[PDB]
């Protein structure tokens, strides 16, 4: 007896690939997206059809691709990673920058915040990790081995412990996500390999095959599901118990079976009831869970 | 009190580092600017305290730090040749090489499990290695911060985690030691400042003034003491209560600048203090 993901509409406004989506718990009606068009967009979500949402504010300043973005728990502040080797801290409401973070020398690929909002963990394309103060000061710079993936963390300035978990994963293509409770971590390999790893228990669990080159991963914050953006569609796996819940492929009426856009970013709703996917065609598509 | 018991004079350069083994009380290891390490047979005899037994000569420059496994079977050394070597203590031959540092290598430690090696560069870079010689992580803090990287014990190689503690210490000169029970850490600043820090309690304790440029620190394995090698001799502080237990300045002959200690090491049982000197000699105090 099964649930289902149902295509809800769409969200246009970007000119380039939608490379990252971000959600906020304090603001369920707010979505943040980053794009190769060098901007981020904040979205007012109405839940209508098909205008699921509508642009609110454009965030400009990055001189090149924005690869990653994230929101504070309250939705008040956004963080972005760019190919201009910079990170910016944004005022969500006013769309202006409060802090540049300079120092990475490879394209910047990921960003996260420690719950305390005190510090920022960023990730480079060469796999270099930097830990910053909210004031834009780089405190530590960490670089693991190529055949390893990691989870850099900041335990709760005169001082700070940082715990870094390393996990051997030979084929890894450096595409990671941590489970809501940060108890699980999914790591994408070659040919669609997705290795799952238990952090609290310190061992792998199994390896899934999304069967095609994985571009993005995102755990459900409510259910035991992992969504994987594939060149071929979005696969949503049930983790316990293991089944493949659904394979979200939209129709692209205007495209040939070959040149079909694909999802390159994923994000679940604060209530894990909505799945956002950013696409190779500049569009954000939205599924909802039904029965 | 500390009483000067003898001497160990086999080196041809500064004795830069001493190492002790719990599983082998009569074994001492030392490194020198003469590019070698020496293993020593300790007799306790009179000023023939110890006698050279081996001579590890693989490095092509100053060996700066060394350490022994808990059992005394294996030694690790750090060199200005930007390398680290793993040694068989008994046979004196290398079993693996650690290349990758590009600044002089200043410190080495082993995680209790013997699985991995933490090394420290002069440019304050920290590298975590597999016993097989493979660098797994490379970490570099801010200059005004000092750091104790630890390998977490899986507690059960594909997986491994590292907790790195950072402590603000502006004046710091990157001379650092940890309490045996990893609860405490002493960090040397300028003009002899020694900041003490409680790790388990995440905050400073106080700052001890040595009034003399420090070169080496070593906490006591049993007693709450911190020894500090100074340009004027070796200060041994009691930490609770705080007083200067002793200031060990040995006897040179004749009648300006005098040889000073640049390395320290307590025996496993805290009863003996070894200090390596600017005059190629290792001197030995015992508690009475």
Curated annotation (Swiss-Prot), chain A:
There is a cross-link at residues 44, 51, 105, 135 (Glycyl lysine isopeptide (Lys-Gly) (interchain with G-Cter in ubiquitin)). One of its GO terms (molecular function) is protein kinase C binding. One of its GO terms (cellular component) is nucleus. The modification Phosphothreonine is found at residue 94. Disruption phenotype: Defective activation of the ribosome quality control (RQC) pathway. WD repeats lie at residues 13-53, 61-100, 103-143, 168-207, 209-249, 258-291. InterPro entries: G-protein_beta_WD-40_rep, RACK1-like, WD40/YVTN_repeat-like_dom_sf, WD40_repeat_CS, WD40_repeat_dom_sf, WD40_rpt. It is found in: Cytoplasm. The keyword Ribosomal protein applies. Belongs to the WD repeat G protein beta family. Ribosomal protein RACK1 subfamily. Component of the ribosome, a large ribonucleoprotein complex responsible for the synthesis of proteins in the cell. The small ribosomal subunit (SSU) binds messenger RNAs (mRNAs) and translates the encoded message by selecting cognate aminoacyl-transfer RNA (tRNA) molecules. The large subunit (LSU) contains the ribosomal catalytic site termed the peptidyl transferase center (PTC), which catalyzes the formation of peptide bonds, thereby polymerizing the amino acids delivered by tRNAs into a polypeptide chain. This is Small ribosomal subunit protein RACK1. The lineage of its organism: Eukaryota, Fungi, Dikarya, Ascomycota, Saccharomycotina. The gene is ASC1.
From Swiss-Prot, chain B:
The keyword Ribosomal protein applies. Component of the ribosome, a large ribonucleoprotein complex responsible for the synthesis of proteins in the cell. The small ribosomal subunit (SSU) binds messenger RNAs (mRNAs) and translates the encoded message by selecting cognate aminoacyl-transfer RNA (tRNA) molecules. The large subunit (LSU) contains the ribosomal catalytic site termed the peptidyl transferase center (PTC), which catalyzes the formation of peptide bonds, thereby polymerizing the amino acids delivered by tRNAs into a polypeptide chain. This is Small ribosomal subunit protein RACK1. Pfam families: WD40. Transmembrane segments: none annotated. Belongs to the WD repeat G protein beta family. Ribosomal protein RACK1 subfamily. GO terms for molecular function: G-protein alpha-subunit binding; GDP-dissociation inhibitor activity; protein kinase C binding; ribosome binding; translation regulator activity. The keyword Acetylation applies. CDD domains: WD40. Component of the small ribosomal subunit (SSU). Mature yeast ribosomes consist of a small (40S) and a large (60S) subunit. The 40S small subunit contains 1 molecule of ribosomal RNA (18S rRNA) and 33 different proteins (encoded by 57 genes). The large 60S subunit contains 3 rRNA molecules (25S, 5.8S and 5S rRNA) and 46 different proteins (encoded by 81 genes). RACK1 is located at the head of the SSU in the vicinity of the mRNA exit channel. RACK1 interacts with the mRNA-binding protein SCP16. RACK1 also exists simultaneously as a homodimer in a cytosolic non-ribosome-bound form. It is found in: Cytoplasm.
